[PDB]
Symmetry: D2
Subunit: 90 residues, 4 copies
């Protein structure tokens, strides 16, 4: 559990297909992909690295394909920025 | 009234107090500051426009712990920024 | 541009399809529907105004599973309602 | 853990002081209070029952007092409506 509020919910398009690997413990699945979402003005769109661990990692690899529009819920992490996903709506 | 969902709400600590000026139109206030939040700690640039720019300037100070609501933005190498909608101290 | 933070984002299933009409001003579209989400399951009235009212009417149908972003409202005994800002199907 | 997204973050005022009790297991603290927040128009303000379990329950009772303005993060639950709090910013 985390002590601080860090709720980031984004509607985005999958632009780099999810790749899966097992973490150091050779037991926890970890999936990473890249998504793109609109700038606040038309601002170039933004691209963000998205990472999921465990069950959500398997769901990302299983469901997310290039050009799919999804909603992601996760915590912002940061120098490289990334969204550590908790849930995804396909 | 933006097209896409982009809701980022974070609890963070001000590590670089707000600085305000007026933008291009030479009428709209714009405030920028930097906050830090738990992961080492992450540092994030925060920007507010209009009425909220004035609120940030009026209330946020170094070391203040606040809640920020805004939209995530990545501008161009790449620099992440939270464009603030509302702030709670 | 509301004063207070009120951000409610829920994944839910449409259990009563949207119905649309025009409001008082006799110009602004307003759509109402009912969704259900996991706790027995909870049922929640959902209302949208203007452009999003039309989006709800155009895209949401019985049994659809969607994501809704809006502000929580309790009107008067008491009835809870989510006033929609955005919807994703 | 919950399968569905249910992220409700509200800025509100404490209007009924937190009351603490121990759940059925006579071990898990549970605190409940009531908060009030603005209607969407000036709509009468809304009042909502707020409930916290475990560590957050102790934090609510310890910190939240009448007229305190707080930010609550939790999941909406519903016939009586209530916000099951995960985190609070005092």
């Amino acid at each position: 559990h985390h002590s601080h509020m860090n709720s980031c919910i984004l509607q985005a398009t999958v632009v780099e297909a999810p790749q899966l690997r097992y973490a150091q413990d050779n037991q926890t699945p970890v999936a990473e992909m890249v998504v793109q979402f609109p700038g606040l003005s038309s601002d170039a769109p933004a691209r963000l690295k998205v990472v999921g661990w465990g069950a959500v990692a398997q769901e990302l690899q299983d469901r997310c394909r290039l050009n799919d529009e999804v909603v992601l819920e996760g915590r912002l992490r940061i120098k490289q920025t990334e969204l550590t996903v908790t849930r995804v709506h396909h």
